[PDB]
Design a protein around this ligand. Structure first.
Ligand code: CTP
Ligand code: CTP
Ligand code: MG
Ligand code: MG
Lengths: 170, 171
């Protein structure tokens, strides 16, 4: 298997395009309450799904909920795309502020894998150009992750590697 | 700074071309006895320095010394190029056998940086084609490090990042 080591108290940041399988991964490895997703926070602001305007407020709520969990010393997983540096920086700063280890888990899958899963989703789907952009941004992000402030950086390079992950909470 | 976390008991494997600054790094961060270099083991087999005719035997000696240290539960740093998978696999297997974390520290520096430092070395120098080959092999190695068995993988992308490294050992 592929053992990923994380401290008992950490902020685990999922990084991947839409369709890369982040939420599936989160549900398999973590308890429901450990996981905080952007879609969930969007749902706190709106019953609808297509309202492009609640996004900023939703991310504010995401950051605040994450902040209070870490304050209480509770391991937290951020289920969002996180392919942009601007999305990643505040998570890192929150983690440092509460003396937690920020951990990056990167879903370095080929674009066609994401595009394929997207077309078969039963919950919601995105436009093709969105996944293409996410993937390009994801790839651009990899090299600078350690320097951004992530203490552990784990790159998953194929669905097989993703499948074989086991977490080891020292 | 750039904090690199390592368990109290680990095998730290330095990965980089000649001239990338591994031994400098080792001396700055670790105690002399924690560090085992290929040059040193070559020196056990031959007075002729950087002697190439004793290379295999020297690596056998390096593997054996590393093995006994981990057996005694002593953190060990392997100061060698380590840019080939064949050089890295046995280190990983030794670490596993003694229930130790293998940790990879990669000196992902541009070739020209290594070539430049090489020309100014006062101890020993290598041919330019050697550093070019090392660098290409180093770059090819990076992606598969985790899958090879390294528990923590640290990539240093510039001399600045290398400079700013501080190790954090928690037992
Ligand atoms: N190992 C996996 C992971 C995901 N999927 C498929 O991918 C689709 C969506 O995966 P999801 O986990 O929702 O991807 P996310 O990264 O969460 O996408 P988003 O950012 O849009 O939430 C699901 O229908 C699922 O069938 C799959 O077949 N096998
Ligand atoms: N930050 C650094 C580190 C090293 N050097 C110089 O670069 C040369 C090679 O450094 P060294 O640690 O000896 O490189 P290694 O990677 O150990 O080379 P080898 O594989 O040959 O042992 C030395 O002159 C050293 O003074 C430097 O100028 N600045
Ligand atoms: Mg999802
Ligand atoms: Mg050296």
């Amino acid at each position: 298997s592929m053992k990923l080591t994380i401290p008992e108290l950490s902020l685990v940041v999922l990084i991947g395009s839409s369709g890369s399988g982040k939420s599936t991964f989160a549900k398999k490895h973590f308890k429901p309450t450990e996981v905080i997703s952007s879609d969930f926070c969007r749902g706190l602001m709106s019953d609808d799904e297509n309202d492009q305007t609640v996004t900023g407020a939703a991310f504010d709520v995401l950051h605040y909920i994450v902040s209070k969990r870490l304050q209480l010393g509770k391991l937290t997983v951020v289920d969002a795309t996180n392919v942009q540096e601007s999305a990643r920086k505040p998570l890192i700063e929150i983690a440092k502020d509460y003396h937690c280890f920020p951990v990056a888990v990167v879903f370095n899958l080929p674009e066609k894998v994401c595009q394929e899963r997207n077309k078969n989703r039963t919950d919601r789907q995105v436009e093709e150009y969105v996944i293409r952009k996410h993937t390009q941004q994801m790839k651009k992000s990899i090299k600078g992750l350690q320097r951004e402030g992530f203490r552990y950086v784990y790159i998953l390079n194929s669905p097989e590697e993703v499948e074989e992950v086991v977490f080891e909470r020292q």
